[PDB]
Ligand binder design. Structure first.
Ligand SMILES: [Fe+3]
Ligand SMILES: [Fe+3]
Length: 243
């Protein structure tokens, strides 16, 4: 019901190319039962360096477009911030957005980022009074099968996010993400996940799987847990409330 990680702004990153694509992506998200989407387009040194004024501009146009989808679809502003050290000054001085202007910022790393680097970056952001929500923790080799490390990040004041796509069963044929599904399944079993979110980009390779994932978590982990990960926690994040 509340999706805190999405790529829905046209012509700013690897998401929609056009207004028409953004609308179609919103529509599919709405169809699946999502009622609030936080826009978190990429901020990444050397990869996604679209200027902030453009991202904000196209964002506001997507927010308008969302009215054509449904009147109760709320679009919030945010950023998926790949960590490089310049990001610290940007956050301190609010030149890079948090999630709906809350304390929470969405932070990502590389698949092969060493734990010590992860731990260090997140420690420094915490020192800014900003709470990291760690994007797609199933991506990071450093956390694979590592309850102790994830726990250590959570215990110092981080929250964790897993992509809906990796919540799904590994497919009998054509499975290209088996290792990330196994990782997400590990974290869920260990009860190490605060949030499941879309990371949606398009309707081909990367659609939302929020309805499918919600049902799967309901079946395997109970409805209350599904509510927690897909509604209650995301809602606290959007409303700048402590979890
Ligand atoms: Fe990412
Ligand atoms: Fe993303």
């Amino acid at each position: 019901m509340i999706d805190i990680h999405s790529h829905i702004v046209f012509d700013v990153d690897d998401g929609p190319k056009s207004r028409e694509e953004s609308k179609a992506l919103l529509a599919e998200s709405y169809r699946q039962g999502v009622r609030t989407i936080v826009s978190t387009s990429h901020r990444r040194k050397g990869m996604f360096e679209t200027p902030e004024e453009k991202i904000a501009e196209n964002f506001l146009q997507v927010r308008e477009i969302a009215k054509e989808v449904a009147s109760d679809l709320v679009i919030a502003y945010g950023a998926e911030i790949y960590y490089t050290p310049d990001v610290l000054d940007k956050l301190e001085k609010k030149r890079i957005p948090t999630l709906n202007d809350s304390r929470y910022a969405l932070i990502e790393f590389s698949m092969n980022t060493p734990y010590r680097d992860i731990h260090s970056a997140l420690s420094k952001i915490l020192m800014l009074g900003i709470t990291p929500v760690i994007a797609h923790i199933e991506r990071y080799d450093a956390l694979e099968n590592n309850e102790k490390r994830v726990r250590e990040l959570i215990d110092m004041g981080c929250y964790t996010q897993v992509n809906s796509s990796h919540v799904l069963k590994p497919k009998l044929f054509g499975e290209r993400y088996k290792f990330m599904k196994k990782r997400a399944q590990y974290f869920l079993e260990q009860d190490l996940v605060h949030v499941i979110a879309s990371d949606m980009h398009n309707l081909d390779g990367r659609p939302p799987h929020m309805a499918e994932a919600y049902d799967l978590v309901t079946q395997k982990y109970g409805e209350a847990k599904a509510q927690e990960l897909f509604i209650d926690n995301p809602r606290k994040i959007v409303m700048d409330q402590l979890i």
